[PDB]
Amino acid sequence: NMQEAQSIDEIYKYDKKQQQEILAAKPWTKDHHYFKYCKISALALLKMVMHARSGGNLAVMGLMLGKVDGETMIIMDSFALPVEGTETRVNAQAAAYEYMAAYIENAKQVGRLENAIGWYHSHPGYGCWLSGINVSTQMLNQQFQEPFVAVVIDPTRTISAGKVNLGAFRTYPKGYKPTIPLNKIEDFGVHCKQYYALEVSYFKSSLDRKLLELLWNKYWVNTLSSSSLLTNADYTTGQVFDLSEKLEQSEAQLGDKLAKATRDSCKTTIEAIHGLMSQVIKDKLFNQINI
């Protein structure tokens, strides 16, 4: 069951005509919040993470390759740049651009049919947000290269907490505003009203899943007995709290959001039913032997 292109690998197709039609029509010119979804390949995340950690506490960055399907940015590769940078400020003077177009020209022959879809930057341990000059960077990147998104990575937070600190951001055009609050400015920038985040999800290939499932498990009291359904109790409480506001906004709209709210609630209920199933299978495995 590998020769056929399943629903998992169907995203690995680069249709030149469809992308050309999308880039010619330009539906994003009218709707400012046109893009919402950001799908990212696994290996891009891997290369990004290893490049961020290889530089240590020095900021590193690169250009990513991908396409756009409707309102979803599908990124299929990451790439490193030969730049010199400090903890907070970088230049990318000439070496990056001497290894940017040359890399594209080289990749045109190996089989890489993708083009520039955005850039990722590593912020070492000071949040996932668009800086005061990075917002202008995405300003002039989007003003002429409309299919585009800025990716921000925190290496220190990911390496310490254990969760991927990834953020996909796009900015509003100058003039589109819709005194600063004290809760949306610490997790964002001082120009938080000038940019918004996009939902981020990842995809992989069928052979990737097959290799992962046979790589190494052990994980008997590491996964099969790990206080499941309980470790993310704070996550579930936060989710069940914000579904209240989601449903109340949906009801106000009724007096569409409701499908999104139902999907959001279904995700949590399915996750915790999976936790219950794991607990039940553990009970049937260990407790009920040798009565």
Added chain:
Amino acid sequence: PEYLSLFIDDKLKKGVKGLTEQEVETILDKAMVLFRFMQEKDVFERYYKQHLARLLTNKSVSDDSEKNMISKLKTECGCQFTSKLEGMFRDMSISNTTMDEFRQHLQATGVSLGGVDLTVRVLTTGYWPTQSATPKCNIPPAPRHAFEIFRRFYLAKHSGRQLTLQHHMGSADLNATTRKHILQVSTFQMTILMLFNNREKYTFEEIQQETDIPERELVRALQSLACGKPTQRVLTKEPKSKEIENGHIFTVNDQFTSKLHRVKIQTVAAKQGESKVDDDRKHEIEAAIVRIMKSRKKMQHNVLVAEVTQQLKARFLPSPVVIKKRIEGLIEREYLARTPEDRKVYTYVA
């Protein structure tokens, strides 16, 4: 600014010409508005210190005019330097009141060694400028005992402090020879004459052996006691020469000459005033610059000052004043140009 301080000192020194306070206060208003368009008041106030150090002598000022001008300066300047000049004035006033108290104590409890007049004018160390560690010139017996009893009195009352008597500055008079003439000497000359007294035929090496006379500032006094004296001609040396190295023998002579009974050698004050930090300053500048760009830590208004001095290993190198001036001059463009009204956002951790 040195010129402005010179002009202010010259105008305030001689209040006979234009004793009206209106013209003086209009001059001070002009000086204040001229200083307003200018900056860098640190050199301005260190020059104030230099001129007022060489107030230590006879007042020859108006006092209340200085109080008025310093009050009008503090109205628009603030604290620290204005407060230390207020400390100057408060120190002088409390010194004169303590002198009055000591005189009252001497009158109440009679002390024979208090017959000599004492005009102790103790100062403070945290506000007044410092010159050096000062020498340890020997004190004659009677002044030594008078200062000892004054020290004993001052260790009483309010305790917790000592008095390190200096010798760089001071005004004294002495009765000499024949009509008795009153001469004016300044500390070192007093001890030199006292040593001359008990035995004649005293040479320079003998004086230098047991007086702890200074080395660098000795040059000014050595060429002031002779080599260009006025018509008074109180004392001369038999080795008449421009330079006197080691063995010029001094002699005591009557030399009555002038009939004036208040001959003074204050003229030496009118002529004695005439006439590697590179690596340290480079290191300080580089440290300040790397601290201001590198830190970028979350601050509101003061924790940045804490972390910058935390980063350094040795102290007195930070010197928070340089951080203050750097962050003050750092507002010229976008970076560190945040709102004074709400000093909350400071690029946070970026």
